[PDB]
Design a protein around this ligand. Structure first.
Ligand SMILES: c1ccc([C@H]2COCCN2c2ccnc3n[nH]cc23)cc1
Length: 157
C-alpha cells in the first residue's frame, strides 16, 4: 500500500474471560467502543506510544505489551493512510478509570459489542481472541462501509 502513513497504536487488555474496551468520547470515531490508543508522537517508540495512550485514556500501566497485529486503513478522500500497530496485554497494574478521551468498561468475551464497534473489528478481533497474529488492510468509505479488505495470519507482526 503506497503512500505516507501515520502511525497509531491499539491496545487490547485481554484477560482470560474479559476484554477492556473504551467508549471514545471525542474526535474521530466518537460513539464507538474500541481498544485504547491513538497517534504515535515524535520522540517515542511505537510501544512507548501505546503505553502513553493507555495511561492517558484509562490510567493503566502494564508490565508487558505484546505485538499481535498490524492494520492499514484507507479512508476514501483522506490522503494519509493509517498504520495501526495492535498490542495485547494481560498484565495491567490497576483499575481502569474514565478519561477525557475514553470511558472504559469490561466485556465478557461472548458479549463483545461488535454492533457498536468499528466494522473491521468483527473480522480481526476473533483472531486476537484465538491468539493468532495478523495483518489486515481495510478500505473505508466514511465510517460505516468497508469497500475492500485483506486479512491474513502472520508469523511476524
Ligand atoms: C486507536 C486507533 C484507532 C482508533 C479508531 C479511532 O480513531 C480513528 C481510527 N480508529 C479505528 C478505525 C478503524 N477501525 C478501528 N478499530 N478500532 C479502532 C478503529 C482508536 C484507537
Amino acid at each position: 500500500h503506497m503512500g505516507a502513513s501515520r502511525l497509531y497504536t491499539l491496545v487490547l487488555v485481554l484477560q482470560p474471560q474479559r476484554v477492556l474496551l473504551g467508549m471514545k468520547k471525542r474526535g474521530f470515531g466518537a460513539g464507538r467502543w474500541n481498544g485504547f490508543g491513538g497517534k504515535v508522537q515524535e520522540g517515542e517508540t511505537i510501544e512507548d506510544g501505546a503505553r502513553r495512550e493507555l495511561q492517558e485514556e484509562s490510567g493503566l500501566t502494564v508490565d508487558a505489551l505484546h505485538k499481535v497485529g498490524q492494520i492499514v486503513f484507507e479512508f476514501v478522500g483522506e490522503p494519509e493512510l493509517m498504520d495501526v500497530h495492535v498490542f495485547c496485554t494481560d498484565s495491567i497494574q490497576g483499575t481502569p478509570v474514565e478519561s477525557d478521551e475514553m470511558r472504559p468498561c469490561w466485556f465478557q468475551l461472548d458479549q463483545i459489542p461488535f454492533k457498536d464497534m468499528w466494522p473491521d473489528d468483527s473480522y480481526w478481533f476473533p483472531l486476537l481472541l484465538q491468539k493468532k497474529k495478523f495483518h489486515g488492510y481495510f478500505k473505508f468509505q466514511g465510517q460505516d462501509t468497508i469497500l475492500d479488505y485483506t486479512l491474513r495470519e502472520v508469523d511476524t507482526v
